[PDB]
Amino acid sequence: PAWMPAYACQRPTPLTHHNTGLSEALEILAEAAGFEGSEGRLLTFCRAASVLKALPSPVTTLSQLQGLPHFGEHSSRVVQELLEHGVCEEVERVRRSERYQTMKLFTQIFGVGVKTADRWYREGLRTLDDLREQPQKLTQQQKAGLQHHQDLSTPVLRSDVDALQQVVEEAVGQALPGATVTLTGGFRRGKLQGHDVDFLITHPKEGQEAGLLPRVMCRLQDQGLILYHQHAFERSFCIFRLPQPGSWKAVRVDLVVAPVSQFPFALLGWTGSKLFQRELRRFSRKEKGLWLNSHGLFDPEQKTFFQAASEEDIFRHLGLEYLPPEQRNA
DNA sequence: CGGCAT
DNA sequence: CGTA
DNA sequence: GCCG
Ligand SMILES: O=c1ccn([C@H]2C[C@H](O)[C@@H](COP(=O)(O)NP(=O)(O)OP(=O)(O)O)O2)c(=O)[nH]1
Ligand SMILES: [Cl-]
Ligand SMILES: [Mg+2]
Ligand SMILES: [Mg+2]
Ligand code: NA
């Protein structure tokens, strides 16, 4: 064989695709690699999973893997076992292990990463109740993640997004006339549910957006909408008290402010997917010698930044065919 | 061998 | 360390 | 784990 470029940013990956079972097994091994501190193995298994998402058809025979980037002996054996038996022993052993289940439980708490989760695991902790019993071990961020864990485990729906965008737009418009709010993250790629809602805020006049995020946060807090926030800043990782009929639920909301000169770069970065953006930044540095992030695209030889008005401008400058957000689901 | 996004 |  |  199939046409398959080596970088995920070089091929469309739609929201709905084939090979979900194969990819899900490889993503288990990727997650497990991360839990053991092997970020390189995590990347390869993520990349191999992503290749299967971009293929035109279901993989039914091992021969359909011939020539594909990021498939070597290990990833191919996993697919082979799934095709020949419907299960992969290594994947089942990982999935059912106490280590994997506990690390997954702890790292899905807001404020907990692999290193913290592993420290707790080595100390004998296994459940969220164990963590509540030892609050000396917890940052304020982790306390918020634990306190709202049940709600944060509930998928965020489009109806939630629409309600949240309205209250964010109200606060932004109170804080700075003419400022705008753009939905980014997974919902912009067409995802129907998510773990949070991500919003990008800017203003058409360069510089007007300075100091905006603290003013937005104060106005949301005054409406009773903020359960948790981190506190001059450009990114806010919040938990909102989202009104529901007769009640409310906690929802993670991320806010990012960019000057309008940087808006295309921030929109590109925050629309994702995470793997798509890692691969795009890798492509930029290795194939073009340019450094890419949410602020800009830097040429370290001329010592200049590329001026962009659109995401299309950035793809074109990197020599890449443009992909709309719904084809960035790597 | 070492990189693996910023 | 955590976060996007 | 895979590859530049
Ligand atoms: O490590 C990261 C995490 C996120 N990002 C970018 C891409 C990602 O799509 C976007 C928003 O991050 P989220 O964690 O909110 N992921 P997403 O919105 O894609 O999915 P969901 O929120 O449903 O998990 O920010 C990175 O660049 N690096
Ligand atoms: Cl960034
Ligand atoms: Mg998101
Ligand atoms: Mg987010
Ligand atoms: Na976490």
- A238 with A200, same domain: the answer is yes
> From ligand 3's centre to the CA of A255, what distance in Å?
11
- A229 with A290, same domain: the answer is no
Q: What is the C-alpha end-to-end distance of chain A, expressed in Å?
A: 20
The residue behind tokens 């995470």 is A274
CA gyration radius for chain A?
A: 21
| Angle between helices A212-222 and A158-175 in degrees, nearest 10 | 110
Nearest ligand 1 atom to alpha carbon A271: 9
Is the Cβ–Cβ distance between A197 and A251 less than 8 Å? yes
- Determine how β-strand A180-183 pairs with β-strand A197-202: antiparallel
Mention every residue, 6+ apart, whose C-beta is less than 8 A from residue A289.
Answer: A299, A300, A301
- A281 with A320, same domain: the answer is yes
Is the Cβ–Cβ distance between A107 and A101 less than 8 Å? no
Q: Is the CB of A274 under 6 A from ligand 1?
A: yes
- A203 with A251, same domain: the answer is yes
The DSSP 8-state label assigned to residue A235 in this structure reads: E
- A229 with A285, same domain: the answer is no
Is the Cβ–Cβ distance between A197 and A253 less than 8 Å? yes
- A59 with A70, same domain: the answer is yes
Q: Which of A231, A260, A289 is the last residue of a domain?
A: A260
Q: Which two tokens stand for residue A48?
A: 């191999």
Q: Is the CB of A160 under 6 A from ligand 1?
A: no
Alpha helices in A234-289 (DSSP H): 263-271, 274-283
Q: Is the CB of A264 under 6 A from ligand 1?
A: no
> From ligand 2's centre to the CA of A123, what distance in Å?
34
Q: Which of A242, A260, A278 is the last residue of a domain?
A: A260
| CB-count burial class (<10 Å; 0-12, 13-18, 19+) for A179 | buried
DSSP A166-209: HHHHHHHHHHSTT-EEEE-HHHHTT-SEESSEEEEEE-SSTTTT
Residue A222 annotated to the active site: no
- A143 with A171, same domain: the answer is no
> From ligand 3's centre to the CA of A302, what distance in Å?
35
- A23 with A85, same domain: the answer is yes
Closest residue (by CA) to atom 28 of ligand 1? A274
Number of domains making up chain A:
4
- A44 with A108, same domain: the answer is no
- Determine how β-strand A156-157 pairs with β-strand A193-194: antiparallel
Give the residue among A27, A62, A32, A60 at the shortest CA–CA distance from A46.
A27
- A132 with A190, same domain: the answer is no
Give the residue among A70, A143, A149, A154 at the shortest CA–CA distance from A105.
A149
Q: Distance between CA atoms of A19 and A21, rounded to whole angstroms?
A: 5
Closest residue (by CA) to atom 19 of ligand 1? A186
Q: Which nucleotides of B are covered by protein (CB under 7 A)?
A: 3-6
Mention every residue, 6+ apart, whose C-beta is less than 8 A from residue A17.
Answer: A53, A54, A55, A329
- A229 with A210, same domain: the answer is yes
Collapsing DSSP to helix, strand or coil, A236 comes out as: strand
Give the residue among A134, A278, A110, A122 at the shortest CA–CA distance from A196.
A110
Which residue's alpha carbon is at the shortest distance from the C1' of C4?
Answer: A270
Residue A128: count of CB within 10 angstroms of its CB: 15
Give the residue among A38, A35, A199 at the shortest CA–CA distance from A108.
A35
Q: Distance between CA atoms of A144 and A229, rounded to whole angstroms?
A: 9
Give the residue among A285, A232, A323 at the shortest CA–CA distance from A293.
A285
Q: Distance between CA atoms of A107 and A113, rounded to whole angstroms?
A: 5
For residue A123, the enclosing domain spans 98-154
Q: Which two tokens stand for residue A177?
A: 């006339």
Q: Which of A211, A226, A260 is the last residue of a domain?
A: A260
Q: Which two tokens stand for residue A287?
A: 């194939």
- A7 with A74, same domain: the answer is yes
Q: Is the CB of A34 under 6 A from ligand 1?
A: no
